[PDB]
Amino acid sequence: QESVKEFLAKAKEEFLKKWESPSQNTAQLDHFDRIKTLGTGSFGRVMLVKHKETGNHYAMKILDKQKVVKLKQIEHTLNEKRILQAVNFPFLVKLEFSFKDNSNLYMVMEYVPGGEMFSHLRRIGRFSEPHARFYAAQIVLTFEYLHSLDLIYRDLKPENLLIDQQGYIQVTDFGFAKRVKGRTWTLCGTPEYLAPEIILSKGYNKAVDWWALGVLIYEMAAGYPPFFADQPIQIYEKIVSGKVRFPSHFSSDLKDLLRNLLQVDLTKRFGNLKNGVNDIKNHKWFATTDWIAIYQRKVEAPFIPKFKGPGDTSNFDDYEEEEIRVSINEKCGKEFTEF
Numbered sequence: 001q002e003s004v005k006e007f008l009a010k011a012k013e014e015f016l017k018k019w020e021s022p023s024q025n026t027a028q029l030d031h032f033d034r035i036k037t038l039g040t041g042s043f044g045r046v047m048l049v050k051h052k053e054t055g056n057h058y059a060m061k062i063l064d065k066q067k068v069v070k071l072k073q074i075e076h077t078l079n080e081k082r083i084l085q086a087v088n089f090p091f092l093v094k095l096e097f098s099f100k101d102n103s104n105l106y107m108v109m110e111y112v113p114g115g116e117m118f119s120h121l122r123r124i125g126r127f128s129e130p131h132a133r134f135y136a137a138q139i140v141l142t143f144e145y146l147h148s149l150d151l152i153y154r155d156l157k158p159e160n161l162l163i164d165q166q167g168y169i170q171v172t173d174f175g176f177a178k179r180v181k182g183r184t185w186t187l188c189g190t191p192e193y194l195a196p197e198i199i200l201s202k203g204y205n206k207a208v209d210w211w212a213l214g215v216l217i218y219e220m221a222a223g224y225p226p227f228f229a230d231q232p233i234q235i236y237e238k239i240v241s242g243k244v245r246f247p248s249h250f251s252s253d254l255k256d257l258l259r260n261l262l263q264v265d266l267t268k269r270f271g272n273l274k275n276g277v278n279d280i281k282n283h284k285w286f287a288t289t290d291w292i293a294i295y296q297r298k299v300e301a302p303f304i305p306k307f308k309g310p311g312d313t314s315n316f317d318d319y320e321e322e323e324i325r326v327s328i329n330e331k332c333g334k335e336f337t338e339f
């Protein structure tokens with residue numbers, strides 16, 4: 001449809017202008033108070049912070065430059081920030097500021113107090129098909145947007161889908177996102193969500209995102225992922241076999257869609273055929289979906305997360321509060337020049 005073509009053309013124009021001239025150094029650390037550690041990993045953490053002048057809350061992702069270098073994540077961290085400062089879509093968490101100092105890299109994101117889809121899914125067990133479909137439609141549109149910009153997301157999983165105050169998804173964590181025209185080769189993503197071509201160390205493309213969508217829809221509707229096993233090697237063996245067992249409660253339409261998304265042969269996988277995303281959007285499982293209404297956030301969500309306000313952290317987990325230090329000496333300045 002020309003309306004969608006023209007929408008995506010404008011989206012790409014606006015992305016490219018920011019991509020080619022990225023914003024830098026748009027806030028500083030001492031304009032924020034630290035409130036609580038919301039997550040932590042091997043080279044960084046995410047903090048709830050409050051801006052001292054406006055009172056606004058944000059989720060601040062803080063990466064230790066020395067650890068980024070040591071764990072060979074330099075390009076990934078530069079990808080994440082350059083992409084986030086250039087994208088704009090209703091179901092992507094917004095980057096509001098970024099900056100760096102002697103020790104760390106900072107991305108100041110909107111804070112979504114409703115928490116991760118993962119916690120809501122694990123609490124209730126599984127989502128009904130309408131509920132899963134509401135979230136899946138938002139991911140389809142988001143991947144249509146990202147892929148049109150030549151971006152591969154590469155980290156789809158329930159933990160990275162936050163549920164906002166209207167019950168809609170906001171995708172977070174662009175740590176593995178990359179602008180790719182053609183193929184790319186890095187081993188990354190979470191085991192249960194990896195496409196076979198990643199496991200097999202092949203050059204792969206945006207079709208890995210559509211595979212991961214199949215995993216996500218299965219997990220939302222079943223309560224567990226399709227290739228589950230105790231050990232990673234067993235997960236990988238199941239993935240590359242592609243044998244998937246569907247619960248009897250799955251509709252026939254859902255099983256058909258999942259067979260086409262969880263297609264081991266990437267040249268036969270929905271999302272990667274001549275009709276692209278339209279094979280997914282036109283599938284019978286999505287017959288009830290008004291794609292424009294979803295994009296415009298006019299559909300009433302299946303549920304609204306419970307939270308008390310923009311500073312409520314009750315939907316996130318508790319972590320040891322550790323210092324955020326800034327060395328008196330600049331570290332790794334060269335490697336992060338463009339950040």
Ligand SMILES: CSCC[C@@H](NC(N)=O)C(=O)O
Binds near residue numbers: 033034047049324325
């Ligand atoms: C807002 S997160 C950073 C706050 C923290 N760090 C420094 N070095 O000032 C501190 O004041 O201890």
